[PDB]
Amino acid sequence: PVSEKQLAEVVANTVTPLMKAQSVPGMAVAVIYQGKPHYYTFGKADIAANKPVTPQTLFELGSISKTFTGVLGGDAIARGEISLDDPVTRYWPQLTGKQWQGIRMLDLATYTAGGLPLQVPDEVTDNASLLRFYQNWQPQWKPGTTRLYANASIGLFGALAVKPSGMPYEQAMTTRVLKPLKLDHTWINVPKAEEAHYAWGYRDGKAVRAVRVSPGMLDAQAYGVKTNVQDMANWVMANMAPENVADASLKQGIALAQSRYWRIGSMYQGLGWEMLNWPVEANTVVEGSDSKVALAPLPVAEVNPPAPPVKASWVHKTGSTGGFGSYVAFIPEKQIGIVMLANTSYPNPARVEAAYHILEALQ
Ligand SMILES: *C(=O)C1=CN=C(C(=O)O)CS[C@H]1c1cn2c(n1)COCC2
């Protein structure tokens, strides 16, 4: 098997050319191998201040936030608070438009409601205006027919999924997912004392960080998760090996998020997480990551009933913000995984290629 020495070489020999080519100021990587995380840090968290990346540097996860949403929703299912087969309207009775009949919580969670757009528009500034948006929405497709990746879909799922708990999303997430997993440096809102750890993002040479949206059902979730490479490694480990998670509903929620709900070409949609059967070749995964494909409306095949987690899977998620680019992938059958956090948003295919190359060294 590969030694720790060899693994360190593989990671450096992969990441250093990638950062040069993609002009990445700083990256934190964790590889999960032989039951533990291995950490590698590169470059700068803050160029002007000459602060290096460390295992405590906070990065913006962007859309990898959706994996936390998915698990939180799974946990709520396992508690009996929601069911994926319930109508959206069960959790939002004020949503009276008849276009919503036949749209399930599952459809919101997995982007199959029938054309909810990528973004919630900026006109949406509060709950009254969020309601007007969803009430006015005209589906382009029937439910359960077309996948269109969308913050307006899973964001609403997250907001509604926590309603029975009585907690807002940020508090539900922290209480039910983060704290039990000891992810104690994972934030929506970075506390003031934690600010020294927060990297700057870089976009066309400008230092940038995430903004917020207007207050409401989606605020905390849109502001997106920030975390360091250690917490993210432990997040990957929990999702790779939920058998080691003691809380019964959270263990089940992790499994629900890695279940297969829909097939779309060579991939399968989970709750937040996406999956391909393992073995998979690099070009399959890399080509599917291009935004011309990843953001396209594509036909789905229902997996009814949902398939529970398949150990021989490539499980992954990309996520970006204006200044950050991150990627996570793991293969439960092999008990290997990787986290790559960077403070520039560089092309998703390049992230997948590097992650694949590193994990390939370990099988
Ligand atoms: C997730 O990583 C993600 C979410 N969705 C959108 C979007 O709502 O516009 C686009 S794909 C991706 C994303 C979001 N941002 C970027 N990429 C780049 O920085 C701006 C925010």
DSSP of 105-155, one letter per residue?
Answer: HHHHHHT-SS---SS--TT--SHHHHHHHHHH---SS-TTSEE---HHHHH
**How many domains is the chain built from?**
1
Ligand 1 atom with least separation from CA of 118: 8
Ligand 1: which of 59, 60, 61, 63 to mutate, judged by most atoms within 8 Å of the beta carbon?
A: 63
Structure-determination technique? X-ray
Count CB atoms within 10 A of the CB of residue 184: 12
Q: Encoding tokens for residue 150?
A: 């969308």
Partners of 45 in the beta sheet?
A: none
Identify the residues whose C-beta falls under 6 Å from ligand 1. 62-63, 118-119, 151, 319-322, 345
Contacts 24+ apart (CB under 8 A), 265-270: 265/298, 268/303, 268/307, 269/110, 269/111, 269/112, 269/147, 269/300, 270/70, 270/110, 270/315
Find tokens 């594509």 and name the residue. Answer: 298
Residue nearest atom 17 of ligand 1, based on CA coordinates: 320
Task: Give residues with Cβ within 8 angstroms of 223, minimum separation 6.
Answer: 188, 189, 210, 212, 213
Assign 94 to helix, strand or coil: coil
Q: Using alpha carbons only, how large is the chain's radius of gyration in Å?
A: 19
Measured between alpha carbons, how far apart are the two ends of the chain, in Å? 8
3-class state of residue 192 by DSSP:
helix
Between CA 300 and CA 224, with CA 156 as vertex, the angle to 5 degrees is 105
Burial class from Cβ neighbours inside 10 Å (0-12, 13-18, 19+) for residue 18 reads buried
Identify the CA nearest to 220 among candidates 189, 262, 257: 189
Give residue 109's identity as a one-letter amino acid code: A
Residue nearest to atom 12 of ligand 1 (CA): 320
Closest CA to 149 of 288, 282, 279, 254: 288
d(Cα 134, Cα 156) in Å, to the nearest integer?
10
Ligand 1 atom showing the smallest separation from residue 323 Cα: 19
Helix (H) or strand (E) holding 338: strand 336-342
Nearest residue by C-alpha to atom 15 in ligand 1: 321
Q: Which atom of ligand 1 is nearest to the CA of 319?
A: 2
Containing structural domain, residue 138: 1-363
Beta bridge partners of 227: 59, 186
Judge whether 57 and 64 are in contact, CB under 8 Å: no
The ligand 1 atom nearest the CA atom of 321: 19
Give 295 Cα–ligand 1 centroid separation in angstroms. Answer: 10
Which residues contact residue 302 at a Cβ distance below 8 angstroms, ignoring those fewer than 6 apart?
144, 261, 262
CA 319 – ligand 1 centroid, Å:
7
Give the number of other CB atoms < 10 A from CB of residue 251: 18
Q: Are 318 and 326 in contact (CB under 8 A)?
A: yes
C-alpha to C-alpha distance for 359 and 363, rounded to whole angstroms: 7
**Closest alpha carbon to 27 in 360, 354, 363, 362:** 354
Q: How far is the CA of 284 from the centre of ligand 1 (A)?
A: 22
Residue of 61, 320, 324, 328 to mutate, ligand 1, most atoms within 8 A of C-beta: 320
Q: Which atom of ligand 1 is nearest to the CA of 318?
A: 2
CA of residue 297 to ligand 1 center, whole Å: 16
User: What is the crossing angle of helices 248-257 and 229-240, to 10°?
Assistant: 90
- In which region does residue 117 sit, left (phi positive, over 0), alpha (psi from -120 to 50) or beta (all else)? beta
Evaluated on CA atoms 215, 217, 219, 220, the torsion sign reads: positive
d(CA 114, CA 18): 38
Give me the residues paired with residue 342 across strands.
27, 325
* Ligand 1 midpoint to CA 156 (Å): 16
Question: Could you please report the per-residue DSSP string of 216-245?
Answer: STTHHHHH--EE-HHHHHHHHHHHH-GGG-
| Cis geometry, peptide bond prior to residue 305 (ω within 30 degrees of 0) | yes
CA distances from 357 to 29, 203, 204, 263, 360 (A): 14, 26, 27, 25, 5
Catalytically active residues are: 63, 149
User: Is the CB of residue 160 less than 8 Å from the CB of residue 91?
Assistant: yes
119 alpha carbon – ligand 1 mean position (Å): 9
What CATH number is attached to the domain comprising 257? 3.40.710.10
